[PDB]
Design a protein around this ligand. Structure first.
Ligand SMILES: *C(=O)/C=C/N[C@@H](C(=O)O)[C@](C)(Cn1ccnn1)[SH](=O)=O
Length: 245
C-alpha cells in the first residue's frame, strides 16, 4: 500500500500514547530488528520477565522429566489469587491461564541447582536466579531486555533453543493465542506486579500462512486500572499496521 516508514512509526507510537503508558514493540524480520512505540530506549533495558518465564520453565521441566504434557497438576484446595486457578490443570492449561502456582510447583521439582544451570545454558537475560527457586522470575534477580525476549522467541519459533525438538514443539503447542486469516499468533503474556514500576509483556511470533515466522516482543509500563488485554490490543494493532497480520 506504499505506506511510509514515518507513518508506521507515528501510528504505532500513537497506540502506546493512547493507552497513556510508555512502551516498545520489537519486531524481527529475518535477521533485522525493528523497534517501534513511544519509548524506544526501553528496547535494551532489563525488566523482570514475569510470566514470560513460564515458556522456559516449561522447556526445562519437560526436558528434565519433571512433568509430562498430560500430567494433571491438582489444585491443593488453598485459596489462589484468581478463582479460575482453583482447579486441576495440565502445564498447557496453566500456560493459557498463566497459573503461577502450577509453575512454582514445576520450578520446585526442577530445584535451584538444575534451574540455575539450565537458565545459564540457555543464556536467558542476565541469567541470575538468586537463591529462591520459586519466585526469581517475578521479583528478581532475573532480568531480561525486550531485545533478548524477541531473540528468545525467534530461537523458540525456529526450534533453535538447546532442548530436544520434541520439547520445543510441546511448549509451542501451549502458546497458540489467536488465528487471523491464515496467520497464527503464538505468544506468552507477563505482568510483573511485584516490582515498581510494573512491567507488562507480550512476547511471541506470528506464523504466516506461507510458513514464515515473525517474532515480536511488546514491553510496557502497566498502571493502575489498566486491563491485561491492552497488551494484546496494542500488539495486534501494531502487527496489523505493519501488514504482518
Ligand atoms: C505472570 O506474569 C503472572 C503474574 N501474576 C501476578 C498477577 O497476575 O498479578 C501475581 C500478583 C504474581 N506476581 C507478579 C509479580 N509479583 N507477583 S498473581 O500470581 O498472584
Amino acid at each position: 500500500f506504499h505506506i511510509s516508514s514515518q507513518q508506521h512509526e507515528k501510528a504505532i507510537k500513537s497506540y502506546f500514547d493512547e493507552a497513556q503508558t510508555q512502551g516498545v514493540i520489537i519486531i524481527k524480520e529475518g535477521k533485522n530488528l525493528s523497534t517501534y512505540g513511544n519509548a524506544l530506549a526501553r528496547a535494551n533495558k532489563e525488566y523482570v520477565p514475569a510470566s514470560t518465564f513460564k515458556m522456559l520453565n516449561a522447556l526445562i521441566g519437560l526436558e528434565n522429566h519433571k512433568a509430562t504434557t498430560n500430567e494433571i497438576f491438582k489444585w491443593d484446595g488453598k485459596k489462589r489469587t484468581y478463582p479460575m486457578w482453583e482447579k486441576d490443570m495440565t502445564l498447557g492449561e496453566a500456560m493459557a491461564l498463566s497459573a503461577v502456582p502450577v509453575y512454582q510447583e514445576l520450578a520446585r521439582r526442577t530445584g535451584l541447582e538444575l534451574m540455575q544451570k539450565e537458565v545459564k545454558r540457555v543464556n536467558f537475560g542476565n541469567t541470575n536466579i538468586g537463591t529462591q527457586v520459586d519466585n526469581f522470575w517475578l521479583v528478581g534477580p532475573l532480568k531480561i531486555t525486550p531485545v533478548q525476549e524477541v531473540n528468545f522467541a525467534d530461537d523458540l519459533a525456529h526450534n533453535r533453543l538447546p532442548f530436544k525438538l520434541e520439547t520445543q514443539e510441546e511448549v509451542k503447542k501451549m502458546l497458540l493465542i489467536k488465528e487471523v486469516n491464515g496467520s497464527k499468533i503464538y505468544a506468552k503474556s507477563g505482568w510483573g506486579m511485584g516490582v515498581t514500576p510494573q512491567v507488562g509483556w507480550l512476547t511471541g511470533w506470528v506464523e504466516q500462512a506461507n510458513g514464515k515466522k515473525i517474532p515480536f516482543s511488546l514491553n510496557l509500563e502497566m498502571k493502575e486500572g489498566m486491563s491485561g488485554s491492552i497488551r494484546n490490543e496494542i500488539t495486534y494493532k501494531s502487527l496489523e499496521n505493519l501488514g504482518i497480520i
